[PDB]
Design a protein around this ligand. Structure first.
Ligand SMILES: [Mg+2]
Ligand SMILES: [Mg+2]
Ligand SMILES: [Mg+2]
Ligand SMILES: [Mg+2]
Ligand SMILES: [Mg+2]
Ligand SMILES: [Mg+2]
Ligand SMILES: [Mg+2]
Ligand SMILES: [Mg+2]
Ligand SMILES: [Mg+2]
Ligand SMILES: [Mg+2]
Ligand SMILES: [Mg+2]
Ligand SMILES: [Mg+2]
Ligand SMILES: [Mg+2]
Ligand SMILES: [Mg+2]
Ligand SMILES: [Mg+2]
Ligand SMILES: [Mg+2]
Ligand SMILES: [Mg+2]
Ligand SMILES: [Mg+2]
Ligand SMILES: [Mg+2]
Ligand SMILES: [Mg+2]
Ligand SMILES: [Zn+2]
Lengths: 110, 53, 116, 122
RNA sequence: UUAAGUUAGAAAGGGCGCACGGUGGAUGCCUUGGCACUAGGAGCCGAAGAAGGACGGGACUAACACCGAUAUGCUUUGGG
RNA sequence: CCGAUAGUGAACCAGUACCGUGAGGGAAAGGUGAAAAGCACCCCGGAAGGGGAGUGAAACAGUUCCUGAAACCGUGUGCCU
RNA sequence: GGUUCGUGGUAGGAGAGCGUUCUAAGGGCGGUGAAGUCAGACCGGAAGGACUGGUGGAGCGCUUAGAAGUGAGAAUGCCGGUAUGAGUAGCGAAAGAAGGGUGAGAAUCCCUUCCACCGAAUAUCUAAGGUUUCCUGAGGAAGGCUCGUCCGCUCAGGGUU
C-alpha cells in the first residue's frame, strides 16, 4: 500500500515548486526531508509539510513503517490563477498571474 | 527585439535542461545521527558535528 | 427555431486531429495545423501511389542488370533477347528469380543469348 | 578587500559598527562576507589593545564606537567599549599570537538566502 | 598478446504512442428570466401635494423587500 | 419563439459595479443533493490543505459543489534519438 | 439490361445528396442507464453513420413529410480561456548595524544602543480636497511590487463636546 498527501491551491507558481519537488522524487523519506531542509527555496517548507503529512498518513491510517518509505510519486499541478494588474508607463496596465499549485506527494513502503 | 516565432514545447524544454537545482552537500552526523551540511554547525546537536559549541 | 452550433463542429475537427496522430508537436494537437498536415499527407499519398510503381520497376531493373552482368549480358541486351525469344516474364518476376533462384534466371538468360 | 555593496564612508561605518558589536557581545550572527572583513578589523583592534600604550588606545578610540557596554557600580561609573577592549578583551589574548576570532557557518537566511555565520572571539 | 576489420550499447535532455492527473468551462440536459402575439379590461397621476427620491422603522440589521415617528405595521369587514 | 456568449443591457439585489467634470457610456456573474443527511471522531499542519472515519445512490456530488470538451501544464513509460 | 464515346479544372451554370434545431404523424429506445463526453484496429463514393467499452445520470432516436437563427479556419473579427517571450525585464531616487524580544515562522514587527539623512524642511500649524483612512482589540485569505507576527488592508467594538 502507499500514502498520499496534497496541498491544494498553494500561492506558489508551479514552475518554482517543480524545480524543488524534482530533488525528492524517488528518495527515502529521511533523506528527502533533509534535502528539503537544506534546499533554500520558498517551495521547500511547503513541500516538507505535504511530505510530512504523507508520512503521518502512512503511519496512522495504514500502519506502514516510517523507517522503510521512499517518495514513490511527487508532482505539482497548476491551481486556479489569481489575475492582477501592474500599472505600467503611458497609462497602460500589464497583466500579472499570481499562480497557485496543487502539490501531491505519495510515499510507498518499497 | 521580439520573438519572430513562438518557441515550441520541445525547444522550451531543451532550453530548461539546465535550469535545475543541485542536491545539497550534506552527510549524517555522529552525535546527532541526523543530516547536516558539511562545514556547518549541526543544530540538532546544537554544535559543530561532535565538537561542542 | 434557433440552431446552436453543437457537437457537429467538435466531431468534425476531432476526426481530422486523429488522422494527424504521430505528427510532430502541434501538428497532432491543433485543428488548424492538423487539418493542413492531413490535407498534405493525402496529397503526398496520392502522388506516392504513382511514384511507388515507378520506384519498384527501377529496383527490379537494377537487380536484373546485376544478375545479367554475372552472365556477361547487360539489362538492355537481356530484355532484347527475351523479347526476341518470345518470353513475356515481367521485371518483378525476373528480379525475384535473380534473388531467389539464380539457376532459373540463368536458364532465361540462356534463352536470351540463343535469340541474339 | 571587499566593497560590501556600500560606498567608502558607509562601508567604514559598517566595519566600525560590526567591530564594536563583536568587542561588546563577544559573539555576533552576520553574513559571511561581512564576517570575513570584520575578522581583519577586530584582530587589529585586539592587537592595539595588547600593545596597551596611550598611542594604541588613541588609534582604537579613532575606530571603536562610543557605546556604553555596562554600568559596573564602585557612584556607578559606566564602562565604554574602548575600556572593555583594553581592560577585559585584549589581556585575555596575552599569550595568543593572532587568530582571536572564529567564523562558524550557520546557514542561509529565510528572507534573502544570505549565507549567515557566527563570528566569535577566542 | 599484437594487428586489421566489423558491429553493439548509451539519454543530459528531446520526439512519437499510450495511461493517469491538473487547469479550463465548451457541450448536453435543465430553467427562476426573456421575446412575439391573441382575447378581454383599462388608458392617466398632481396643491386633498404627483412622478421620482432621501432618511428612518426589526431584539441584534450591511443589503433587499415591506412600512412611515401609529414605521417589519394600527382599525375594521369578509375569507381561511 | 430563446434557453445563460442565446433571450431584455439586466434569469443573479443592473441601469448596479465600473468609466466620465458632465451630458452620458455601461458590464461580468444561473445548476451540491431527493433530503443538509453540509463530513462527529482520529491523524499531519500555526492555518490553508489533506489522509482516514462517517453521511449519501454517488463526495472523482464537499457551500460557487450537474456534465466537464479543447488549448495549456504535469507524472509514468513501449519504441526512437 | 447491354454496346459506344466520355469523366483535369478557377469564376460560374446545372444536378443529386450529407448533417444540424424545431413541428406533425407513425413506430421505437431509455435507471437492466438517455443526451453529452472519452476511446477504438468498423461501415458508406463524399458530406457522414454505426457498434463496443469507459464517464454521465435523464432524456433521445428512427421513418415520411414540413419549417429554418441550418454547417466556419481565416474578417489586424467579438468574448472567454490558455500559451510564447521567461524564471526573463522590472521590483519607482535615499544608510544602516548588532543585541534583546515576540512568534509556527523574522533582513522586513517591537525595544535598545550606535550610526546616517532633512532642518525656509523631509519640522510645526491651517485652508482645500478626501470621507472614517483616526483609537483599541483580534487577523494574515486577498491588497502591500519581497517578507510580514506588521499595515492607510480584513473583522469587531469605539472615538469628534
Ligand atoms: Mg498617469
Ligand atoms: Mg511504365
Ligand atoms: Mg564623504
Ligand atoms: Mg378576522
Ligand atoms: Mg445575456
Ligand atoms: Mg452552459
Ligand atoms: Mg463540477
Ligand atoms: Mg482525363
Ligand atoms: Mg470535373
Ligand atoms: Mg437535444
Ligand atoms: Mg448560422
Ligand atoms: Mg477562433
Ligand atoms: Mg531573453
Ligand atoms: Mg539578463
Ligand atoms: Mg535584474
Ligand atoms: Mg523602493
Ligand atoms: Mg536652503
Ligand atoms: Mg491606525
Ligand atoms: Mg506578499
Ligand atoms: Mg496587525
Ligand atoms: Zn551533530
Amino acid at each position: 500500500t502507499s500514502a498520499k498527501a496534497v496541498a491544494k491551491t498553494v500561492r506558489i507558481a508551479p514552475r518554482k515548486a517543480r524545480i524543488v519537488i524534482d530533488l525528492i522524487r524517488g528518495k527515502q523519506v529521511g533523506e528527502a526531508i533533509a534535502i528539503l531542509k537544506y534546499t533554500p527555496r520558498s517551495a521547500s517548507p511547503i513541500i516538507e509539510k505535504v511530505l510530512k503529512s504523507a508520512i503521518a498518513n502512512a503511519e496512522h491510517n495504514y500502519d506502514l513503517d516510517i523507517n522503510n518509505l521512499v517518495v514513490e510519486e511527487a508532482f505539482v499541478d497548476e491551481g486556479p490563477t489569481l489575475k492582477r494588474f501592474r500599472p505600467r508607463a503611458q497609462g497602460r496596465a500589464s497583466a500579472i498571474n499570481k499562480r497557485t499549485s496543487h502539490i501531491t506527494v505519495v510515499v510507498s513502503e518499497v | 527585439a521580439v520573438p519572430f516565432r513562438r518557441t515550441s514545447k520541445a525547444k522550451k524544454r531543451k532550453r530548461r535542461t539546465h535550469v535545475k537545482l543541485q542536491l545539497p552537500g550534506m552527510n549524517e552526523c555522529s552525535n546527532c545521527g541526523e543530516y547536516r551540511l558539511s562545514h556547518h554547525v549541526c543544530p540538532e546537536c546544537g554544535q559543530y558535528d561532535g565538537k561542542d559549541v | 427555431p434557433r440552431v446552436k452550433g453543437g457537437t457537429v463542429t467538435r466531431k468534425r475537427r476531432k476526426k481530422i486531429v486523429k488522422l494527424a496522430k504521430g505528427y510532430y508537436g502541434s501538428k497532432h494537437l491543433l485543428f488548424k495545423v492538423a487539418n493542413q498536415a492531413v490535407m498534405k499527407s493525402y496529397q503526398y499519398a496520392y502522388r506516392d501511389r504513382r511514384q511507388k510503381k515507378r520506384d519498384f520497376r527501377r529496383l527490379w531493373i537494377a537487380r536484373i542488370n546485376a544478375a545479367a552482368r554475372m552472365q556477361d549480358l547487360s539489362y538492355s541486351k537481356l530484355m532484347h533477347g527475351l523479347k526476341l525469344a518470345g518470353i513475356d516474364i515481367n521485371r518483378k518476376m525476373l528480379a525475384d528469380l535473380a534473388v531467389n533462384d539464380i539457376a532459373s534466371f540463368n536458364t532465361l538468360a540462356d534463352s536470351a543469348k540463343k535469340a541474339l | 578587500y571587499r566593497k560590501l555593496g556600500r560606498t567608502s564612508s558607509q562601508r567604514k561605518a559598517l566595519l566600525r559598527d560590526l567591530a564594536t558589536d563583536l568587542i561588546v557581545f563577544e559573539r555576533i550572527e552576520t553574513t559571511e562576507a561581512r564576517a570575513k572583513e570584520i575578522r581583519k578589523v577586530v584582530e587589529k583592534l585586539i592587537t592595539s589593545g595588547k600593545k596597551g600604550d596611550l598611542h594604541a588606545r588613541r588609534q582604537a578610540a579613532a575606530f571603536i564606537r562610543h557605546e556604553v557596554v555596562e554600568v559596573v557600580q564602585v557612584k556607578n561609573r559606566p564602562v565604554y567599549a574602548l575600556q572593555k577592549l583594553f581592560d577585559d578583551v585584549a589581556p585575555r589574548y596575552a599569550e595568543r599570537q593572532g587568530g582571536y576570532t572564529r567564523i562558524l557557518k550557520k546557514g542561509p537566511r529565510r528572507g534573502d538566502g544570505a549565507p549567515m555565520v557566527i563570528i566569535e572571539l577566542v
